[PDB]
Structure 1
Amino acid sequence: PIETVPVKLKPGMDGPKVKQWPLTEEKIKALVEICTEMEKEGKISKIGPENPYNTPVFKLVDFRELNKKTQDFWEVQLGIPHPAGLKKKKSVTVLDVGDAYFSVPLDEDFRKYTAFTIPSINNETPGIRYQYNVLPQGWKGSPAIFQSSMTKILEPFRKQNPDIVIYQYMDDLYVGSDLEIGQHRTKIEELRQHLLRWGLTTPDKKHQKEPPFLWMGYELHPDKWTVQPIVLPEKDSWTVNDIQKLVGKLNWASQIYPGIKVRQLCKLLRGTKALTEVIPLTEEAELELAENREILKEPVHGVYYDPSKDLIAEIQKQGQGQWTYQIYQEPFKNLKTGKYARMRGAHTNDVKQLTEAVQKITTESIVIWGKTPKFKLPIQKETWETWWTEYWQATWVPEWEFVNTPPLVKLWYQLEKEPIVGAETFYVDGAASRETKLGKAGYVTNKGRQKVVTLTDTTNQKTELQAIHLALQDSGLEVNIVTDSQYALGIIQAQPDQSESELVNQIIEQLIKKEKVYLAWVPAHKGIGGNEQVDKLVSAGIR
């Protein structure tokens, strides 16, 4: 009595015309009894020569080709619910709808495309042919069309019973109420009756499963949730595939186990290498593997969402470019946890990287809870403010407060806005070969000092940073430097604590040590005094 959904083929396609191979006499004997039953129950129907299509028997029938030819649908349960967005309940019930697909009829005109053949054993006489009258197992459209039917069926019952939450997922209905167990059990059977009016069957009270419920790898209790325990095998030798399996398990745990870290097990997987290639663990990896093992020995659990309390997220810098966070409504009861990998750019600043962790968590929180959290951040309120008012990019974090849990995040240095009187003025520059990769970088000063160095297998820009490296190394604690590379001026005014290049990092430490630095830029090849002397010296070798 369920009305069909009109379903069409992709524009300009015909149905599957795949040849059917022969089968075991034992296989042919088994299939004919399966189909003869399905035909009696009206799931399939015998067909004749009028039908030109066919699909091979394997799910009972392999619809790879029909699925390629079938229209697209709109996304169905695109993402999955996270347990931490479920609200607490006192009575839960799961009914698995049994004859799900068989209970929804297939669009009459579409049915001709689902034809299949049971061959005869001798294979000199043609076999028995059928087509589907109901949503076939493994047809691309069957899940979406069933869900459309199920949502329509559930509508009135939802209407007459607002306080009952029914979440639908695959063949299963998850039903939740704050009724007392007896009245809950009454409502469940009311639901079963309503569903049975449409031919959908579910387990009676004696056969319903008792909580906790396993679902999508979670373990759902009425008042808490958890994941099944995570065993990282202990092995002397690790292959590239082995490390893949660790990172995947570890990532899976990140949601409930606070402070998990993967970066240095990830760095091992960087080299392209056969899955069988044994890879020796670095010691940072040997270390952080251990720290993760201790984390997974503790028991953990998450609570559900209390729509009447504020959301709170707290983030801690867990190490080398890694971050970690926890989201709770009550001080020791976290809804979930998580991590952040970041490192989109080579030259990243912690302050910014934190802001990125905040933007990821803000988005995930809208998905799970429909609102944004409040933040606890290891960053002072004016260490934040000076950075962002001097940055070119706009941002916005609407509500956070300082939380004093080291390591704090702070700007390591800040460059001067005016020239330092009495500091030696250095003019810096470099130059390198377009083909031979030989380069030089050096400086001259208004006090008469000057120095050049030679570099190999480098580039113009790398040399230009070396030059600023020279001036800072060989100047006092107050210094003015003048360069022609906007490339090099930008990387330094980014204040990158972490950088891919080893050389960039060293400058950063040198800027900590100096306690006044004024860096300026002048355009190349304009004959500006100071720039012109050093351009001469450092372009000597090759120019």
Structure 2
Amino acid sequence: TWLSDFPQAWAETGGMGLAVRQAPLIIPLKATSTPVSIKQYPMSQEARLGIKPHIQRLLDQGILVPCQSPWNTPLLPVYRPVQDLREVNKRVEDIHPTVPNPYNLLSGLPPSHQWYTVLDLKDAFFCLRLHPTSQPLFAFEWRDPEMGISGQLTWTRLPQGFKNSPTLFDEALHRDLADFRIQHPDLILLQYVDDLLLAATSELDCQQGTRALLQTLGNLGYRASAKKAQICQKQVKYLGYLLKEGQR
């Protein structure tokens, strides 16, 4: 199967990703910014117990680490932990938004390429390391009143809710896939952050290109969802469109 042939490329079998060719990211602040420390609003026990196994897994994976930081933003329960990074986002220097909008992205899909593979990268932002100098920016408080730990944690990887994560990830993956594009000039590769479309002229070419793309992604440290993958189809769902008969 596709599963057995590419164990490193699939999130199901390859472990959590880590983009090994990408330098840890430094996040420049606006020229006047100073740290902001917002106290954690009390959380119900139900919410804390709901969030707790997620925090523990991320600690076990090294994606969260303890820290002491003059920055602090609140964690809210939604259970899944969601950090309110709005006050951090306000203090981080803006970057040019380079992620294309889906409409324009799909304009570069010619009618000659009607065999599609769609891949969805799992935990994409977490594949990109943060430089240690930038980690304290994203700190939050974590209380386990049972275990007694009160203290801060922060992220060692590009975090959810940070305003520049989609653009930084898209630019990083473009750098990492630049050689693949050169090695496969007859394939069409559309990147929308963690959502990838590979298009070829034939089933065979789509199979060989998909093999090459999975091998490349896994080698670089990214991980695709084997469950969601649409491999070598003439109809796929991509970015909310149904791609069928060259339409949409």
Aligned partner (choices 66, 72, 87) of residue 88 of structure 2: 66
Matches within 5 A, 1:363-374: none
* Distance change (3 Å), C-alpha of 1:92 and 1:222: farther
Q: Distance in 2 between matches of 1:206 and 1:147?
A: 20
Please report how far the alpha carbon of residue 147 of structure 1 lies from its aligned counterpart in structure 2 after TM superposition: 1.0
Aligned partner (choices 175, 193, 197) of residue 174 of structure 1: 197
- Percentage identity across aligned positions? 26
Please report how far the alpha carbon of residue 212 of structure 1 lies from its aligned counterpart in structure 2 after TM superposition: 2.9
CA offsets, 1:253-299, max 9 Å, x none?
xxxxxxxxxxxxxxxxxxxxxxxxxxxxxxxxxxxxxxxxxxxxxxx
Matches within 5 A, 1:521-536: none
Please report how far the alpha carbon of residue 221 of structure 1 lies from its aligned counterpart in structure 2 after TM superposition: 1.6
Q: Distance in 1 between matches of 2:154 and 2:182?
A: 38
Q: Does 1:116 align with 2:116?
A: no
Please report how far the alpha carbon of residue 120 of structure 1 lies from its aligned counterpart in structure 2 after TM superposition: 4.2
Q: Does 1:5 align with 2:28?
A: no
Aligned partner (choices 26, 30, 35) of residue 15 of structure 1: 35
**Cα RMSD after superposing both structures:** 2.3
* Distance change (3 Å), C-alpha of 1:133 and 1:62: same
Q: Does 1:127 align with 2:155?
A: no
CA offsets, 1:160-212, max 9 Å, x none?
1111111101211111111x213321220211111111221114599426453
Q: Does 1:56 align with 2:80?
A: no
Name the residue aligned to 1:398: none
Q: Does 1:95 align with 2:95?
A: no
Q: Distance in 2 between matches of 1:90 and 1:215?
A: 13
Please report how far the alpha carbon of residue 119 of structure 1 lies from its aligned counterpart in structure 2 after TM superposition: 2.8
Cα contact 1:28–1:118 (8 A) shared by 2: no
Cα contact 1:98–1:202 (8 A) shared by 2: yes
Please report how far the alpha carbon of residue 145 of structure 1 lies from its aligned counterpart in structure 2 after TM superposition: 1.1
Please report how far the alpha carbon of residue 86 of structure 1 lies from its aligned counterpart in structure 2 after TM superposition: 2.8
Name the residue aligned to 1:243: none
Name the residue aligned to 2:131: 107
Please report how far the alpha carbon of residue 36 of structure 1 lies from its aligned counterpart in structure 2 after TM superposition: 1.4
Q: Distance in 2 between matches of 1:147 and 1:64?
A: 21
Name the residue aligned to 1:382: none
Q: Distance in 2 between matches of 1:183 and 1:61?
A: 43
Name the residue aligned to 2:66: 46
Name the residue aligned to 1:479: none
Aligned length: 220
Opposite residue 47 of structure 2, the aligned amino acid is K
Cα contact 2:119–2:228 (8 A) shared by 1: no
Q: Distance in 2 between matches of 1:205 and 1:47?
A: 36
Q: Distance in 2 between matches of 1:78 and 1:191?
A: 21
Please report how far the alpha carbon of residue 158 of structure 1 lies from its aligned counterpart in structure 2 after TM superposition: 0.7
Q: For 2:186, what is the secondary structure of its paired residue?
A: coil
Opposite residue 70 of structure 1, the aligned amino acid is V
Opposite residue 188 of structure 2, the aligned amino acid is V
Q: Does 1:155 align with 2:173?
A: no
Cα contact 1:32–1:118 (8 A) shared by 2: no
Bigger Rg over Cα: 1
Matches within 5 A, 1:235-254: none
Q: Distance in 2 between matches of 1:61 and 1:159?
A: 39
Contiguous gaps of at least 5 residues in structure 1: 226-543
Opposite residue 127 of structure 2, the aligned amino acid is S
Q: For 2:118, what is the secondary structure of its paired residue?
A: strand
Q: For 1:189, what is the secondary structure of its paired residue?
A: helix
Opposite residue 101 of structure 1, the aligned amino acid is F
TM-score, normalised to structure 1, is: 0.38
Please report how far the alpha carbon of residue 27 of structure 1 lies from its aligned counterpart in structure 2 after TM superposition: 1.7
Opposite residue 91 of structure 1, the aligned amino acid is W
Q: Distance in 2 between matches of 1:60 and 1:98?
A: 18
TM-score, normalised to structure 2, is: 0.80
Cα contact 2:119–2:230 (8 A) shared by 1: yes
Cα contact 1:115–1:129 (8 A) shared by 2: yes
